[PDB]
Write a protein that binds this ligand. Sequence first.
Ligand code: HEM
Ligand code: 12H
Length: 422
Amino acid sequence: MPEFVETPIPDVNTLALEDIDVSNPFLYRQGQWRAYFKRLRDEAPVHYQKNSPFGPFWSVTRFEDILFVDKSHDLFSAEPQIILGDPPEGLSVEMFIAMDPPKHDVQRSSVQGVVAPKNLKEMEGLIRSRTGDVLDSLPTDKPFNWVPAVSKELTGRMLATLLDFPYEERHKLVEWSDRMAGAASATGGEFADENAMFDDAADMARSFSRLWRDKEARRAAGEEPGFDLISLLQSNKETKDLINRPMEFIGNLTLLIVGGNDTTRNSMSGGLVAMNEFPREFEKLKAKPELIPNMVSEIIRWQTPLAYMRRIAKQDVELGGQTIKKGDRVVMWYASGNRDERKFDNPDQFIIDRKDARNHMSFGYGVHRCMGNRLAELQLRILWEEILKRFDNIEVVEEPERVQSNFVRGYSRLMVKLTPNS
Ligand code: HEM
Ligand SMILES: O=C(O)CCCCCCCCCCCO
């Protein structure tokens, strides 16, 4: 697993169509991703790259084509993986995000109760109060890094709540999730030490087993089950014994924590970046706070926290005037589709009252459409409500540092200065 070392990305018009390689995990940081995807959308909407560090792959970059691919599980498989590359040999974990129907459906239906409306309504007060306390704690006298202070802080707490994982150890959930989703061989991310991946897998399984048993014993001793996933699984006849199917046990708990880890964090960081590029939108918001839910959809579209999901063609498929061969990897570039002017007028503008913001494809479409979508939107809505209660302005004071990945579109440093109300 070689490290990816940053080099300057040239202008896309310097290249031949055939040599456009969008697997490069520095395209987002260097701010080249937009022009690169624009050339793909306009000149090669269904595009084969025969030569990449991850092997050959197709890129699908227009909004309508991505819908078709994502919705067509009869034609494209999500197995065995949904990142572009491969996980390191021997620590593939099976997750339903990378499974086809019918097995996908059974696994998803066994956990979906944790984000049912009535269950999210139970989490709401705790989300609000944490959000409030975090924001109350922030300094207003000087800049600070919003990423660890707010985005990661609130996210780590949410992950712990989802499993009733011991609160004081929540950092481990985030760490385990980062290392899994950031493997160099998978996404071109910064994690290239396979030993730490094996260590984490071992520790996770020890820690999740211990928790499962602890929660069984607590329930038997008469603690009321909570709104978490483990309580939910222990309530249903079908999942009461999930610990004895180790692959589904680890897979489902892992998927749930990875699912809302960097996505929600980067949505939280992202809206401040968008507000800084389009500061009028923040005045519009203060004047019409009822826009928050639509703004949340706009933040998610604009940021597009996951750039893609990957599929394999189950058979030959004609698309965009090209022939995708059975067995070929195909990458649905949501980051491109959400900036497709054929769908969205003024795609690169952040417009918090954009009429069709809700139609973004940041959550995908079809049978793998993000199961946590309402939980993400809930958290974002609450963040901005609580921001509006406290702050007349939120200024980004330094160019953000962006994460190295072809999959995560994220921020590691976001220096912010707050100005309180009165
Ligand atoms: C803004 C935040 C988020 C974004 C952008 C996001 C994005 C996605 C995407 C793109 C998919 C796959 C779509 C496809 O293949 O068609 C997905 C699946 C999933 N997400 Fe999220 N997600 C977010 C938040 C969350 C949260 C908070 C959770 C859980 C607590 C979560 C849990 C899941 C799960 C379980 C799946 C698997 C769905 C399936 O395979 O049926 N996500 N998410
Ligand atoms: O080793 C493996 O199988 C795991 C490597 C792939 C990591 C997949 C990350 C899943 C992202 C889920 C985001 C859903 O909101």
